[PDB]
C-alpha cells in the first residue's frame, strides 16, 4: 500500500497542474479572446469547460489518497457529481464532433442548416441535460463513511447488484454508444476520403475538410487509448463480481491495484485538447 500511497498523489498532482493551465488557457483564448470558434472549436470549448470543471477538484482526490477525507458529505457529493458530469460530457462531445464531421463531409452542400442547429441548440439537449440527469445516483449515494482510523468518500449502494448495474451503464454510455457512433461516422468518412477524387467541388474546400478532420481523429484515438486499459480492468472486475471468474484473493488484490493505477493514468485524458493545440498549432 506504500507504493500506491506514494504513486497516486504524484500522478494526481501532475495531472492537476497540467490540466488547470491547459484548460484555462484554451478557455481564455477561445472565449475571452474571441479567436477561432468554428463548429469543431465550439465543441472543443465545451470540452475544455468540462475538463476544467473536473480538474479543479483533483486536490480532494490527492488528499483522500494520501491521508484521509476531512472535507464533508456535501463536498463528497459535489466532487462525485462533477466527476460524473465531466466523464459523460467529454465522450458525448466527442461523438457530436464525429457526427458533425460526417455531416460536413458526406453531405457537403445542404448541411449548413442542420450543422448550425445541431451545434447551437441540439448540443445542450443531447449532451448536458442527460449528463446532469445521470448524476442523480451521485446525489443519492455519494456519502462519507466512518471506516476505522480514517474516513472514506465514496458512493455506497445497497449491495453489489447496483455496483454491477452502474458499472455496465458507465461502460455502455461512455465507451460503446459513442464508440459505435464514431466508428460509423469515421468508417464512412474514411471510405469517402480514399475514394472521392475531390470533396465538394474545389481543391481548397477539399484540403480544408481534410485539415479539419485529421485532429479529431488523433484526439479520438488518444482518448480511447487512454481510457481502454481502465475499461479492461473494470470488465475483469465486473466478471469477478458476476462470479464467472474464480481465483484466489491475490488475483482480486492484483486486479484492484491494476484498476486504481490505470484509472489514475486514464485521468490523463483531460490534457489531450491543450496538448493537441500545442502540437498541431505550430
Amino acid at each position, epitope marked *: 500500500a506504500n507504493f500506491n500511497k506514494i504513486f497516486l498523489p504524484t500522478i494526481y498532482s501532475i495531472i492537476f497542474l497540467t490540466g488547470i493551465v491547459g484548460n484555462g488557457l484554451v478557455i481564455l483564448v477561445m472565449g475571452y479572446q474571441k479567436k477561432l470558434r468554428s463548429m469543431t472549436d465550439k465543441y472543443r470549448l465545451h470540452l475544455s469547460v468540462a475538463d476544467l470543471l473536473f480538474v479543479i477538484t483533483l486536490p480532494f482526490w490527492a488528499v483522500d489518497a494520501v491521508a484521509n477525507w476531512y472535507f464533508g458529505n456535501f463536498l463528497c457529493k459535489a466532487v462525485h457529481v462533477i466527476y460524473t458530469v465531466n466523464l459523460y460530457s467529454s465522450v458525448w462531445i466527442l461523438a457530436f464532433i464525429s457526427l458533425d464531421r460526417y455531416l460536413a463531409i458526406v453531405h457537403a452542400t445542404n448541411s449548413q442548416r442542420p450543422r448550425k442547429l445541431l451545434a447551437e441548440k441540439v448540443v445542450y439537449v443531447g449532451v448536458w441535460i442527460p449528463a446532469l440527469l445521470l448524476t442523480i445516483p451521485d446525489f443519492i449515494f455519494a456519502n462519507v463513511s466512518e471506516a476505522d482510523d480514517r474516513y472514506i468518500c465514496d458512493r455506497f449502494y445497497p449491495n453489489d447488484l447496483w455496483v454491477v448495474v452502474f458499472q455496465f451503464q458507465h461502460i455502455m454510455v461512455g465507451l460503446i454508444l459513442p464508440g459505435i457512433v464514431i466508428l460509423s461516422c469515421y468508417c464512412i468518412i474514411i471510405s469517402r476520403l480514399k475514394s472521392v*477524387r475531390l470533396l465538394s467541388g474545389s481543391r481548397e474546400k*477539399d484540403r480544408n475538410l481534410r485539415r479539419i478532420t485529421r485532429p479529431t481523429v488523433i484526439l479520438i484515438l488518444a482518448f480511447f487509448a487512454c481510457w481502454l486499459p481502465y475499461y479492461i480492468g473494470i470488465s475483469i472486475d465486473s466478471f469477478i463480481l458476476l462470479e464467472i471468474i474464480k481465483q484466489g484473493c491475490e488475483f482480486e488484490n492484483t486486479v484492484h491495484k491494476w484498476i486504481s493505477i490505470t484509472e489514475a493514468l486514464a485521468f490523463f485524458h483531460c490534457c489531450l485538447n491543450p496538448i493537441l493545440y500545442a502540437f498541431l498549432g505550430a
Partner: nanobody, 116 residues
Framework: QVQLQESGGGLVQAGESLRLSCAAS????????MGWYRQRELVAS???????KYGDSVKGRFTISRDNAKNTVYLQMSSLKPEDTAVYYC???????????????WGQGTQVTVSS
C-alpha cells in the same frame, strides 16, 4: 513527391503504330486521373474508372488504356498525320495520403515525328 517516366518516342512512319508508356513511381497513395496533353490541349484523358474523353482531332485515331496495378497509362498511335508531329506530355493527378490535398504532376515530354 512522385516521379513520372515517359517512353515511346523515336522515328516512326505515317499510318504506323506506336505505344507510349507513362509510369509513375515514388510516394503514391492513389492515382486519380491520367491523361496525355499537348496551350496544353487535351488529346486523351482517362480517369481511374475508365471514362475516356478523347479530343476533337483524336476521334478514331487514338485509343487510350490504363493499368492501375502497374501505375501506367498506355496510348496507342494509329493513322499518324503530319499535324500529329508534336511533343506529348503525360499528366497524372495523385495524392500522397488520406489527409493530403490533390496534387498535379507532369512528365518530361515525348517527341514523335511522322516520316514522309
Amino acid at each position: 513527391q512522385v516521379q513520372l517516366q515517359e517512353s515511346g518516342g523515336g522515328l516512326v512512319q505515317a499510318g504506323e503504330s506506336l505505344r507510349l508508356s507513362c509510369a509513375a513511381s515514388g510516394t503514391i497513395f492513389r492515382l486519380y486521373d491520367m491523361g496525355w496533353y499537348r496551350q496544353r490541349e487535351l488529346v486523351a484523358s482517362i480517369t481511374s474508372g475508365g471514362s475516356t474523353k478523347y479530343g476533337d482531332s483524336v476521334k478514331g485515331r487514338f485509343t487510350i488504356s490504363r493499368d492501375n496495378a502497374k501505375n501506367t497509362v498506355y496510348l496507342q498511335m494509329s493513322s499518324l498525320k503530319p499535324e500529329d508531329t508534336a511533343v506529348y506530355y503525360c499528366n497524372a493527378e495523385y495524392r500522397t495520403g488520406i489527409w493530403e490535398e490533390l496534387l498535379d504532376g507532369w512528365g518530361q515530354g515525348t517527341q514523335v515525328t511522322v516520316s514522309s
